[PDB]
C-alpha cells in the first residue's frame, strides 16, 4: 500500500534523529522501491533512492527536501485546504447572493428607483448576484477535480462569469463618472443625472457586454484531459494567440481602463474641492472620499488574480503544489469580493439600515 509505504518512510526518518541509522536507511529504501511501484511521481522516488544510497555510504535532512517532489502527487493537510477553500467560496457566495438580492429588494420595494444613484446600485447588485451564482459550480469542480455538469452548464458558467465581470466593473466605473458629474459640473448634472438617462446608460452596459458574453458562450466547451473532464474556452487556431489577446483585452479594458477613469474622476473631484473659497460644502467631500475607497478596493481585490494570470501564462506553475492552489482560489474569491460585496453596496446598506447598526463607541 502506497499510504502504508509513505508512513514507513516518515516514521523511520525520526528513528535516525551508526548501526541504527544504517538499518533505518535500508528499511527506507525497500519502502521507497515499493512506493514507486504519473512518471513525474516515479522520478521523485529515483532521486529519493539515490540520496538514500549516498546516506548509506555516509543527505541528513536532504531527503525531506526531495520528499516535496512526491508529497503533492501531506494527507490531512490537502483535506484541510480543500475545506478552507470550500468555506471561503461558500462565505463569498452566501454573503454575495443574499447581500445583492437584499439590496435589489430594498430598491424595488422601499426606495422605488426615483434617483439616478439607485439605478446604478440596482444594476451593480444584479451583476453581483449573477457573478456569485457561478461559485457553487467553480468550488464543486475544485473538490472533484473534474467538470461534472456537462457542456451546456459549462457554457452558462463561463458566459455568466465573463458577462457579469464587465457589467459589474463598468456599472461601477459609470457610477463614479455619474458622481464626478454631480461634484464638478452641477449645472450640467441637473440635465444628465436624471433617472431616464441612468436607465439608458445602465441598459447600454448590459447590451454592450453581450459582445463578450456571446463569444465566450460560443467558445465554452467540455474537453477530456488526463481521464478527467475540463470546462474551458476553445479559441480558434492559433488558440495560444487568441488566448493571449483575450487575457490582454480583459486586463486592459476590465482593469487598467476602469482604474484610470475612476482615478482621473477622483483627482478632478479633488481639485473642485480645493477650488472652494458648511454642511452642504462637506457633503460633497464624503462623495469624493467614497470614490477613493472604491478605487483602493478595486486595485486590492483585482490586482492579485491579474498578476497571477500573467505569472501562470509566462512561468511553469506547479498546479499540484499546495500553497500555489491556496493562493489561486484566494485570488479568485478576492476578485468576487469586489464584484458582489462592493464598498458602494456596503455604504447603501449602512445608509438604509442606519438605525439597526448605529451604536455609540
Amino acid at each position: 500500500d502506497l499510504e502504508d509505504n509513505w508512513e514507513t518512510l516518515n516514521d523511520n526518518l525520526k528513528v535516525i534523529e551508526a548501526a541504527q541509522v544504517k538499518d533505518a536507511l535500508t528499511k527506507m529504501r525497500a519502502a521507497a522501491l515499493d512506493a514507486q511501484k504519473m512518471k513525474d511521481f516515479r522520478h521523485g522516488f529515483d532521486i529519493l533512492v539515490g540520496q538514500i544510497d549516498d546516506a548509506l555510504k555516509l543527505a541528513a535532512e536532504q531527503l525531506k527536501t526531495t520528499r516535496n517532489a512526491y508529497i503533492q502527487k501531506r494527507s490531512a493537510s490537502s483535506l484541510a485546504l480543500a475545506i478552507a477553500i470550500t468555506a471561503l467560496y461558500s462565505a463569498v457566495c452566501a454573503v454575495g447572493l443574499l447581500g445583492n438580492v437584499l439590496v435589489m429588494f430594498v430598491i424595488v420595494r422601499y426606495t422605488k428607483m426615483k434617483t439616478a444613484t439607485n439605478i446604478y446600485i440596482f444594476s451593480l447588485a444584479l451583476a453581483g448576484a449573477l457573478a456569485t451564482s457561478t461559485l457553487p459550480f467553480q468550488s464543486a469542480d475544485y473538490l472533484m477535480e473534474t467538470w461534472p455538469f456537462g457542456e451546456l452548464l459549462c457554457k452558462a458558467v463561463l458566459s455568466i462569469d465573463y458577462y457579469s465581470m464587465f457589467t459589474s466593473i463598468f456599472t461601477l466605473t459609470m457610477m463614479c463618472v455619474d458622481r464626478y458629474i454631480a461634484v464638478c459640473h452641477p449645472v450640467k448634472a441637473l440635465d444628465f443625472r436624471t433617472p431616464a438617462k441612468a436607465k439608458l446608460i445602465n441598459i447600454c452596459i448590459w447590451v454592450l457586454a453581450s459582445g463578450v458574453g456571446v463569444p465566450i458562450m460560443v467558445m465554452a466547451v467540455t474537453r477530456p484531459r488526463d481521464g478527467a473532464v475540463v470546462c474551458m474556452l476553445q479559441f480558434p487556431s492559433p488558440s495560444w494567440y487568441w488566448d493571449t489577446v483575450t487575457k490582454i483585452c480583459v486586463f486592459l479594458f476590465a482593469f487598467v481602463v476602469p482604474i484610470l477613469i475612476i482615478t482621473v474622476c477622483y483627482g478632478l473631484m479633488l481639485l473642485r474641492l480645493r477650488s472652494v473659497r458648511k454642511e452642504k460644502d462637506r457633503s460633497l467631500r464624503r462623495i469624493t472620499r467614497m470614490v477613493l475607497v472604491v478605487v483602493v478596493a478595486f486595485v486590492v481585490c483585482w490586482a492579485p488574480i491579474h498578476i497571477f494570470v500573467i505569472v501562470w501564462t509566462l512561468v511553469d506553475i506547479d498546479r499540484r503544489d499546495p500553497l500555489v492552489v491556496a493562493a489561486l482560489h484566494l485570488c479568485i474569491a478576492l476578485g468576487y469580493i469586489n464584484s458582489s460585496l462592493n464598498p458602494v453596496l456596503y455604504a447603501f446598506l449602512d445608509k438604509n439600515f442606519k438605525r439597526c447598526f448605529r451604536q455609540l463607541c
Binding site: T134, Q138, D141, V157, L158, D161, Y162, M165, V230, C231, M232, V250, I305, F308, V309, L328, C331, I332, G335
Partner: peptide, 4 residues
C-alpha cells in the same frame, strides 16, 4: 474571473 480565473476559472479554470
Amino acid at each position: 474571473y480565473x476559472f479554470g
